[PDB]
């Protein structure tokens, strides 16, 4: 019994924490640009 | 099988880009500084 | 009837069969998983 | 007869379920694994 319970204690826990590495996941995959309006001001200049 | 064996082909790749960057944190410890 | 049963048999032996290479096939995966682990604790204190 | 029959069965469903824990919590371990992995690379983007 004891490990019984404590294999599905495992299996929820990395539901969860699986659930967090989806959320980083598409974190991560939705997230020089301080040069072009240096190249622009030069342009101009 | 096929696709534990991708499980295992993505994670010599990733084996490898981790010496990569095992190697580049060995080695990008300079260019911020270097700047900076 | 004879080839039902050559067949039926054979369902099982070789379903035992590729269950045994999934296992070591998991186990792959896995070792795979530690080299990366190591790999990236190691680079934790470089 | 019975009660050792007994035991035994409870036993194989003890050490199967701790080959269960081991495979389970090694998945634990990757998903923990890809959860640090992502956030550092949210971090970076």
């Known amino acids: 019994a004891t490990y019984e319970v404590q294999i599905r204690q495992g299996h929820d826990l990395n539901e969860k924490k699986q659930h967090e590495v989806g959320r980083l996941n598409r974190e991560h995959d939705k997230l020089d640009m301080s040069r072009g309006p240096l190249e622009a001001k030069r342009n101009n200049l | ?36 | 009837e004879k080839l039902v049963n050559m067949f039926k048999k054979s369902l099982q032996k070789d379903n035992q069969i590729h269950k045994d290479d999934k296992i070591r096939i998991m186990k792959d995966n896995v070792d795979l998983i530690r080299e990366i682990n190591t790999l990236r604790k190691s680079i934790k204190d470089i | 007869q019975g009660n050792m029959a007994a035991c035994r069965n409870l036993q194989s469903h003890i050490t199967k379920l701790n080959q269960e824990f081991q495979r389970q919590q090694e998945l634990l371990y990757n998903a923990e694994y890809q959860i640090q992995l992502m956030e550092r690379r949210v971090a970076r983007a």
Do not use: W, Y
């Not at chain 2, 295992?8 to 270097?34: P, S, Y």
């Open chain 2, 1 to 36: 099988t096929t696709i534990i064996m991708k499980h295992n082909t993505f994670l010599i790749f990733e084996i490898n880009h981790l010496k990569r960057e095992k190697k580049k944190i060995l080695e990008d410890k300079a260019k911020m500084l270097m700047q900076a």
